[PDB]
Symmetry: C3
Subunit: 471 residues, 3 copies
């Protein structure tokens, strides 16, 4: 992207922007020993408002100023900062919203938009909540042996359960049969760190893109894609001549959208389905494990929230859309877990053409990066950043929060499209389990929690906790 | 090759298997700073019995259990653990047994194992004994004129000498005639770290193969091999066919087994080249190591400096069946091979998804047996950094596990010329100290630091004072 | 190049040559954390007269013996050490003299040589001197405040001005007319570290060249050079109007085309481009370093100031002969270039197995002369860390070995632009020092830290306090 892949390491010196000294070829990849999080944290304090670094040959400029951020994510979204890091030849996956660029993306965003509206989310709630009953079901069985529960298993399965049932309408008990046709293939597909900036080695060695295109050597081969392409083949047609309708999954919502910009294709439809899995599986599972960790080790908050839930759903009353949005304190806790642990942890935009944003020149082909994780813990926005304090998100405390500093779902036209859905999904899980159980740490518990080194935040060791069937 | 060459640095943490945390793209190669062995060492002593690491993008799973190693090298060798690391486009050398994969490997390994019967190694010992007497004759060079002697020079030239006549039927003194186009061309050939996992850039950039293949970039050009190929083509076309000065060497044996589906001529030269790579620096290295151990541990040297004349007194031609006799020497060798397994590692590519013993191994992963770190594993050897030859002699040593001591590996895909290299070295070793003796020079390295590279070797070349007899 | 791009790390241990122990793939790249200079320095002390290391897969043999250096750079230049590192698909820039190899380079060097004579320099001086005036004006404005001056802003501007005027025969004020299309576009071109060994992943990924050649993937695309190329096509056809004819590098190269085979039209543009790479950052950097050295050594500065006044009294304008007269000026330039050779090192690929002065060198290896290290080697220089213009006095003539001291290389493939580069720097030097005095301020970087890259540069731009005179 940047300078046709040529040596770039003198760029931030020309531009007069501080940053770590690069090695030839590698740039600052060695600086990644502490991980993305600690790297960005270190750099922020050391270099200040703004700093450049090099992922191999790819220059990355990090911005912290809220007005600079707004310019990148919002004002100049469509004009200059429309895309993310460039991707390899992934075949038809090219037309997945997350890999789509420029006009293609723009079209695809506009088509996928009405699928994620609040109104149509309300209609999925029945299907999600039923796996909130399935979650507690499988989670009670461990609370009677009184043993350690690995939460990235019980939530992994829940994330999986919701995805399969909302993405394809395929209904499964994941924890109890991992040999189910779908689950094994989904988890196989899920092996690929598709959206990681180190998925291939484009950063170091950028020529990899043009070479692989021209040789049509595909790095996401038909073999991987086939199973779900056939499931969607036999799905579109088969169960959908029922007349009786019913279907409320993502598939149907997209199927329904194909008639009277514009016109979503079959292969396109499929690519959104796949991309939804990548977006939702490990992310949702992780936020859940992160939430329970904070709750289990803060028993005050747990009970306080635990009584707020019983106060609006008396008698473990089944959760409903309207009464989910009812719960302020539940919302304060999700937002705070995500403040500490923004699973993306970094937001990125390639700069399409030379530009001057709030005073600063940015050359074409650069990656403009917003360090979410670092900014979420920036003392110059939050008092006691390292401390988990659901209190910051009380409405007596909403103006103080800057939407361009708190960015767990990004911002602007290219933010998270399934934010509403991610938030609704996780809350229905939380509500159900918290109603029926209290969660407590034991010595088997990684305390304090260590983090994933890589690009996508995750507990370093699986979150393990002891569960009591309760009041 | 693993997960379509794609980012893989999530496996070992997603399988509970510990190991050093990898850098993006590099994986763990920064850890190679210590060398292959010293890495396997600190990893063993840290993560315990099983650990993974990443060679660039290539996920490498190291196993220490004898049962594991047995399932790998022996049980599942035909079905799961058939091949080593994939190779780049190498032309006709795809036929070399070391490069060949699956059943296509098997056909070859079949056509070959006859050639390595002890009933054929036997009739070979004359042609190689020739060089023992060439080695010692050379070696009296600077033993007599009085000066520190660097042993690699005379051991290198020796190992070179055996291979030439045994792989190609050509007797040369490589040290005295160093401009012989043969010695010239095979040393040109031995520049290539061919069997090294880092020969090319596969590990860190696994997309290299399909690219080099399609574009027909040759990594090992016909030029390199032209002189050997079109030499065999003269030793084997016009041949020793019209005449019958019937010689006993690897070349003729293969030639003969073409007149018994079969083996082609280029399939033939393919094997000869391989025997050089397999034979040359390994045979040299072990000798140097053995000589380090004796010179510095003088009591064991004399203990068979004329227990060597108790069998053949004195200065007798070491005929095959007199060399299998010396069981103490036999296991003096074994101890250097313990202390120094040249391979350092054993490696197999898991051809497809399986769970063996209690452990799951997904397709495309390298299962690696760290031969070195076992040979110095205190859990199996009292005083592991010892040089104590007879921890290996008698039915005293039914405790030697053929999975923990495997400096030639095990199962179908172990060292096919084990018996040859062992015979080669032993026979060489007799006709050196039965004429000389060695003292730690005023320049020798103690303790012996090794080479960081993929083929085990002394850091500095070994230097010893050599004496009269 | 080397052994078909195959693994090469075993070589130097084998040849009996010492050096830092490589890593798989990366060779000794991690040692560049120091930068080229400090790496060469520590290797020099640690390893001795000759050492070897690996730029990824690329073996590099470093040599220090003058006899050995004379052999590589001069004697076996045409036979064995004719080229630098290989390049890969760059389009019409293949015929750029710095990129050409073998027979093509010999032809280009021969065709360009008459352009770089001292005579043609003499007639160029009047043109390139009108930019010292612009320099003095530009600088004054920054000094007219009292705020510290980042020299790079004023020397960068100056270096730019001269090159685009000489190489493309135009007259612009890049500091004041930054949106002049020549300025924009020469700045575009200057983004590429064109001649840097790490321009591409070639050192670490040696198959890149053949892969890119067969697949016609261009690294220097042609939108990068379009404006400037098309400029030459509209500029030469306008001068021949056979009446007026400037003496710049463009004219001299058009002159050469008329009445061994003559310079092509695309070859002409190729050169003009390469002269920008060769002249822009180098001149800027050397000018900065000199000023750093004058401002920290006030005694030398003033001594130089009185020479300049005694030959050009009352701020007289420089001329070819009056520049060459200034002995101390020459010593000062030489001494800075000794401490700060911009190239940091000279390289030549070994085309063919040779024994040079008794040491075997295989085909494919880069032989490298560690210029930065040799300029600071105690064996040849007393207190090599000290700035001492006197090393280059007349009295101190042939204590300077011309294979030790190589700010401009040596032999047939040395700097073709040397005489010019020196004239150019001295011209500007004269004018700034006729008008100004330069003192450190709080913001100067003492001690000086050097760039880590392949083209020597101050790490922080040189900031100084600048006073007027009169
Ligand atoms: C589980 C918690 C989740 C978090 C923390 C999360 C966070 C994010 C973030 C930070 C981005 C990047 C936004 C930007 O660059 O400005 C993003 C993008 C995206 N997310 Fe999510 N997400 C989550 C779940 C989901 C789910 C369940 C879906 C739907 C299946 C989804 C669909 C997407 C899509 C499609 C994009 C790309 C938008 C585009 O390029 O047009 N996310 N998400
Ligand atoms: C000190 C001397 C030698 C040692 C320590 C040695 C050791 C080894 C080891 C450890 C292996 C791999 C075992 C495995 O992965 O299962 C091997 C493979 C091999 N060795 Fe040797 N070797 C030596 C000399 C020789 C000689 C002289 C030859 C023949 C001229 C030879 C031919 C081979 C071949 C052909 C293979 C692989 C064949 C196949 O994959 O089927 N080796 N050796
Ligand atoms: C003070 C500034 C300069 C310095 C220190 C400098 C130094 C050098 C050095 C060290 C080399 C390599 C010589 C070798 O390998 O032996 C070189 C080559 C070269 N320089 Fe310069 N140079 C400078 C300015 C210029 C200018 C202004 C031009 C032309 C306008 C120029 C044109 C070249 C060319 C064309 C080559 C390559 C010669 C060939 O391959 O035939 N240089 N220079
Ligand atoms: C889906 C999707 N499409 C585009 C994005 N994403 C995305 C969604 C959620 C999260 Cl937590 C990260 C990303 C990521 C992401 C960042 C680093 C590593 C892996 C990722 F998926 N990038 C933006
Ligand atoms: C022949 C052959 N084919 C496959 C192997 N080998 C092999 C044979 C003998 C030796 Cl002494 C090492 C190796 C090696 C080896 C390992 C690392 C670096 C160089 C090697 F030759 N072995 C695996
Ligand atoms: C123009 C040109 N053509 C060929 C050369 N050069 C050159 C000229 C001047 C300078 Cl100071 C360096 C070089 C360089 C050079 C070396 C390392 C990094 C950048 C360079 F321009 N090398 C030899």
């Amino acid at each position: 992207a940047y300078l046709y892949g040529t040596h770039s390491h003198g760029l931030f010196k020309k531009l007069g922007i501080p940053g770590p000294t690069p090695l030839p070829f590698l740039g600052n990849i060695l600086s990644y020993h502490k991980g993305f999080c600690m790297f960005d944290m270190e750099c922020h304090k050391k270099y200040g408002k703004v700093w450049g670094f090099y992922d191999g040959q790819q220059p990355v400029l990090a911005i912290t100023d809220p007005d600079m951020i707004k310019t990148v994510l919002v004002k100049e979204c469509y004009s200059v900062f429309t895309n993310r890091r460039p991707f390899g030849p992934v075949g038809f996956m090219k037309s997945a919203i997350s890999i789509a660029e420029d006009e293609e993306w723009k079209r695809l965003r506009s088509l996928l938009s009405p699928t994620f509206t609040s109104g149509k989310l309300k209609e999925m709630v029945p299907i999600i909540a039923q796996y909130g009953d399935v979650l507690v079901r499988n989670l009670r069985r461990e609370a009677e042996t009184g043993k350690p529960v690995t939460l990235k298993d019980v939530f992994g399965a829940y994330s999986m359960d919701v995805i399969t049932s909302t993405s394809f309408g395929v209904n499964i008990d994941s924890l109890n049969n991992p040999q189910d046709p779908f689950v094994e293939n989904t988890k196989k597909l899920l092996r690929f760190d598709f959206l990681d900036p180190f998925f291939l080695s484009i950063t170091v060695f950028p020529f990899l893109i043009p070479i692989l295109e021209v040789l049509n050597i595909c790095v996401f081969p038909r073999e991987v894609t086939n199973f779900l392409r056939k499931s969607v083949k036999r799905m579109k047609e088969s169960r959908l001549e029922d007349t009786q309708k019913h279907r409320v999954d993502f598939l149907q919502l997209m199927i329904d959208s194909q008639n009277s910009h514009k016109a979503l294709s079959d292969l396109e439809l499929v690519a959104q389905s796949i991309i939804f899995i990548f977006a939702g599986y490990e992310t949702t599972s992780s936020v859940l494990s992160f939430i329970m960790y904070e709750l289990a080790t803060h028993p005050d908050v747990q009970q306080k929230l635990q009584e707020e839930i019983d106060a609006v759903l008396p008698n473990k009353a089944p959760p409903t859309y309207d009464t989910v949005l009812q719960m302020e304190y539940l919302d304060m806790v999700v937002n705070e877990t995500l403040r500490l642990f923004p699973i993306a942890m970094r937001l990125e935009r390639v700069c399409k053409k030379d530009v001057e944003i709030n005073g600063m020149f940015i050359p074409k082909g650069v990656v403009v990066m917003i360090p979410s994780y670092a900014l979420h813990r920036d003392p110059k926005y939050w008092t006691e950043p390292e401390k988990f304090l659901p209190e910051r998100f009380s409405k007596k405390n909403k103006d103080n929060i800057d939407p361009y500093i708190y960015t767990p779902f990004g911002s602007g036209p290219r933010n998270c499209i399934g934010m509403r859905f991610a938030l609704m999904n996780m809350k229905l899980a939380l509500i159900r389990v918290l109603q029926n159980f209290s969660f407590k740490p034991c010595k088997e518990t990684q305390i304090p929690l260590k983090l994933s080194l890589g690009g996508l935040l995750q507990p370093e060791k699986p979150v393990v906790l002891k569960v009591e069937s309760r009041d």
